[PDB]
Amino acid sequence: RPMPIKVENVSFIYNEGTPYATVALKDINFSIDDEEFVGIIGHTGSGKSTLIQQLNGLLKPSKGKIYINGIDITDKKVSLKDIRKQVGLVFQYPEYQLFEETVFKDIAFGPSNLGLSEEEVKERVYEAMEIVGISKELADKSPFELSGGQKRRVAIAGILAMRPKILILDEPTAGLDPKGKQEILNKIKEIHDKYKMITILVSHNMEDIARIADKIIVMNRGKIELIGTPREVFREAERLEKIGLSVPQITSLARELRKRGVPIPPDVLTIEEAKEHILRYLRGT
Amino acid sequence: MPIKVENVSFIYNEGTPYATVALKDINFSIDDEEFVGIIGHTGSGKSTLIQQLNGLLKPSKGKIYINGIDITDKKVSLKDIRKQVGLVFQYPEYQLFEETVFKDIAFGPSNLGLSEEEVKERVYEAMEIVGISKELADKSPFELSGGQKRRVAIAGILAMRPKILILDEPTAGLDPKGKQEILNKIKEIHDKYKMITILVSHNMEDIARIADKIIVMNRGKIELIGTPREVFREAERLEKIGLSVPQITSLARELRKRGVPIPPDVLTIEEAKEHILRYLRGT
Numbered sequence A: 001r002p003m004p005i006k007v008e009n010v011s012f013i014y015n016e017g018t019p020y021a022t023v024a025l026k027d028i029n030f031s032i033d034d035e036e037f038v039g040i041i042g043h044t045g046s047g048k049s050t051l052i053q054q055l056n057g058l059l060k061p062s063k064g065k066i067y068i069n070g071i072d073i074t075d076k077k078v079s080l081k082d083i084r085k086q087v088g089l090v091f092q093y094p095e096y097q098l099f100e101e102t103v104f105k106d107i108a109f110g111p112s113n114l115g116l117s118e119e120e121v122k123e124r125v126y127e128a129m130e131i132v133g134i135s136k137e138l139a140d141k142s143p144f145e146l147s148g149g150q151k152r153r154v155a156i157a158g159i160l161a162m163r164p165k166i167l168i169l170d171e172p173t174a175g176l177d178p179k180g181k182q183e184i185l186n187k188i189k190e191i192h193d194k195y196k197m198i199t200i201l202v203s204h205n206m207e208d209i210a211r212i213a214d215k216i217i218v219m220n221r222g223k224i225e226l227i228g229t230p231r232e233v234f235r236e237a238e239r240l241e242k243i244g245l246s247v248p249q250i251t252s253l254a255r256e257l258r259k260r261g262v263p264i265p266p267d268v269l270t271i272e273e274a275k276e277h278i279l280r281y282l283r284g285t
Numbered sequence B: 001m002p003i004k005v006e007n008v009s010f011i012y013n014e015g016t017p018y019a020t021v022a023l024k025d026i027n028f029s030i031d032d033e034e035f036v037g038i039i040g041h042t043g044s045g046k047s048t049l050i051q052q053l054n055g056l057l058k059p060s061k062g063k064i065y066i067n068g069i070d071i072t073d074k075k076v077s078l079k080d081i082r083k084q085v086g087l088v089f090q091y092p093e094y095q096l097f098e099e100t101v102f103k104d105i106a107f108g109p110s111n112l113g114l115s116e117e118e119v120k121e122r123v124y125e126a127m128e129i130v131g132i133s134k135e136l137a138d139k140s141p142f143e144l145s146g147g148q149k150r151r152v153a154i155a156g157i158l159a160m161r162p163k164i165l166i167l168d169e170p171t172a173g174l175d176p177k178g179k180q181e182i183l184n185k186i187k188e189i190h191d192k193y194k195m196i197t198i199l200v201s202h203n204m205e206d207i208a209r210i211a212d213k214i215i216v217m218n219r220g221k222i223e224l225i226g227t228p229r230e231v232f233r234e235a236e237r238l239e240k241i242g243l244s245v246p247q248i249t250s251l252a253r254e255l256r257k258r259g260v261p262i263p264p265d266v267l268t269i270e271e272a273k274e275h276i277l278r279y280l281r282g283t
């Protein structure tokens, strides 16, 4: 240690002033360890977006502290550049933030604003391009002549070009076809394992979250409702249902078979796991 | 037959050396009261197709009959078409809005001339259907939540009382309860008003539960047409063309391969539960 992420008693209120003041986060505590894949789920207006903005410094806590790899990022001594070297944040439909004249220039934007020599930038740009799987020959193309998917690659390379070891993605499969969805999730997981990252994935898709995550943070009206492994979390089917969420289809089935007598775990997370339990139970009867 | 599409093609930049065929020889029909799902990979021509159906695009070739009327004839206006077909685009809340909720919902029916006493009825009926309080009528749309804005946008379309309703990915961006709620209301309005509804979606699980018929697109062609069972039995083909089957269908498939008497085209957890319990009570 230090644990790479610790959020210590954080609250946030928009416009703390002020008759516009509106509480969005209340007493948030958690920590995330090395190499953990984390899922954040919760209803619309539960605070997920506000939270992830605390982690990369777009918002400062109204109370409490956030330590990234042992650095209190809430201290005035720590800039929004220092933070970008540790934490990258990919918003939804990040392709709509492409701005620059060429792919190379768009990817370079961040690291050039970070300072960094031209040699540094150029190596980071090409390293990023390779990681997200876009040919080096696209470097001199206009972003606005690329695929939807290609654009989304370029937007994400811009963030990775800063080599953060914490990567936050807000609904990265949004708008994609079903093959697109698996491809981005596979590539996220592959980059996670390869570079020993923390990855934080915010999503309304319970099925994806359940397959990919080591740990899930469940938000509810600005609070942490629950933290646990996907099994632990999706065992609370009745509670999730009441706070705007859901369980994966396959988990609901396991649940429904249990109610009627079948000795299947109620926290089966994947088709493969369900298959294996159901067949094993049949072989045993 | 309320919808008949005959030999339709469409070309982007028809000019022009940048010309691109997006739709090629489309043929199908949709019967009274059918809930139809349209699925297909990104760029397979789904959006282009639906815009043919409400006249926002005209076919390069071929014809489209709505309630017997060739809407591709120059004699048929956009207004005529908007009385029969409503089209709800993705994230319809990011459209601009009029000054108040009432005015925004009233826009379409007021453009229809139409007794303003009857505009008011259409507005308040539409508000009830999409679940927004009558007390929001005077509010400016910017004071509403994203979900509320989406309700208002949809009420504007329903206030026209179309009998064909087309929705492009209506659950987009919503939380899981949101997603179930919009799909329940869509189905409820469908059954109640005897509509045709057309839902374009990348979510195979939703499309499977709700549709009577599915149109599967692939590189600008119809690849297949059939019931959800018929379509999702073609698992290997769907995989090849950018799509997928519902999780529960995959499971059923995988259990059938290993000896379980479960149909490979189970579409819902409920069906899968019944089949599995039957095999246990059966031996």
Ligand SMILES: CCCCCCCCCCCCO[C@@H]1O[C@H](CO)[C@@H](O[C@H]2O[C@H](CO)[C@@H](O)[C@H](O)[C@H]2O)[C@H](O)[C@H]1O
Pocket (backbone or CB within 6 Å): A043, A044, A045, A046, A242, A243, A244, B129, B130, B131, B145, B146, B147, B148, B150, B151, B154, B174, B175, B176, B177, B178, B179, B181, B182, B185, B186, B189
């Ligand atoms: C064809 C018919 C047309 C139907 C149109 C209906 C569209 C339905 C849109 C539902 C929008 C999202 O649906 C709902 O949104 C509200 C916020 O606005 C969410 O959020 C709500 O959370 C809780 C419930 O968990 C509320 O007490 C809280 O004030 C609010 O945050 C719900 O958790 C979400 O499920």
Ligand SMILES: CCCCCCCCCCCCO[C@@H]1O[C@H](CO)[C@@H](O[C@H]2O[C@H](CO)[C@@H](O)[C@H](O)[C@H]2O)[C@H](O)[C@H]1O
Pocket (backbone or CB within 6 Å): A131, A132, A147, A148, A149, A150, A152, A153, A156, A176, A177, A179, A180, A181, A183, A184, A187, A188, A191, B041, B042, B043, B044, B219, B241, B242, B243
């Ligand atoms: C952490 C880094 C992550 C970066 C990488 C993340 C993005 C990975 C997924 C990119 C999205 C792929 O998304 C999409 O998938 C479908 C599969 O049907 C492709 O496939 C289809 O599209 C085109 C239409 O123009 C057809 O000509 C093509 O034959 C067909 O296969 C789409 O062109 C692609 O845009």
